[PDB]
Amino acid sequence: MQVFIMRHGDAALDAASDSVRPLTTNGCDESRLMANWLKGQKVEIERVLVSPFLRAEQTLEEVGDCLNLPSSAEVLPELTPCGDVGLVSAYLQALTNEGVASVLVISHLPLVGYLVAELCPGETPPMFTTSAIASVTLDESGNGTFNWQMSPCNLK
Ligand SMILES: [Ca+2]
Numbered sequence: 001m002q003v004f005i006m007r008h009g010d011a012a013l014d015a016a017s018d019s020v021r022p023l024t025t026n027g028c029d030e031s032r033l034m035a036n037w038l039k040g041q042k043v044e045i046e047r048v049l050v051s052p053f054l055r056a057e058q059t060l061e062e063v064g065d066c067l068n069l070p071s072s073a074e075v076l077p078e079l080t081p082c083g084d085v086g087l088v089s090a091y092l093q094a095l096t097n098e099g100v101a102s103v104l105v106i107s108h109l110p111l112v113g114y115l116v117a118e119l120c121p122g123e124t125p126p127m128f129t130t131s132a133i134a135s136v137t138l139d140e141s142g143n144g145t146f147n148w149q150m151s152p153c154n155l156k
Helices: 025-040 054-066 085-098 111-119
Strands: 002-007 047-050 102-107 133-138 144-150
Touching: 002 111, 025 054, 047 054, 047 085, 054 102, 085 102, 085 111, 085 133, 102 111, 111 133, 111 144
Parallel strands: 002 102, 047 102
Antiparallel strands: 002 133, 133 144
């Protein structure tokens, strides 16, 4: 199963509180940039998992505007910055055994980095710039391979 791990886009520093910080114009722009790149890669997203935080959901909105995404999305509490990478890993393994062919995961630091390591043996937490995407091929036994990583700058 193809897993695409994405860090939410650039977000405003100030808001009533952290969970509600909106995306910035640039954050939107770059998120659409990465979305179109994926579209050009013949990427077909079957399932979507997103953090409950506004910046994650908005990144999803923006992406969904350029890439054909599922009508629904699953808002996961464990995708927040302090999310339990173990439960995220298990959720992904579940979908893998379910038959799901591909999933797009939109989250935050430091979770995104740890998630890749947790899923892929021998890998250290990679560095994620905003809107950057990590590709991981996960098998039924929870064994994942870190394929590549793409960021708005390596396209820009
Ligand atoms: Ca469009």
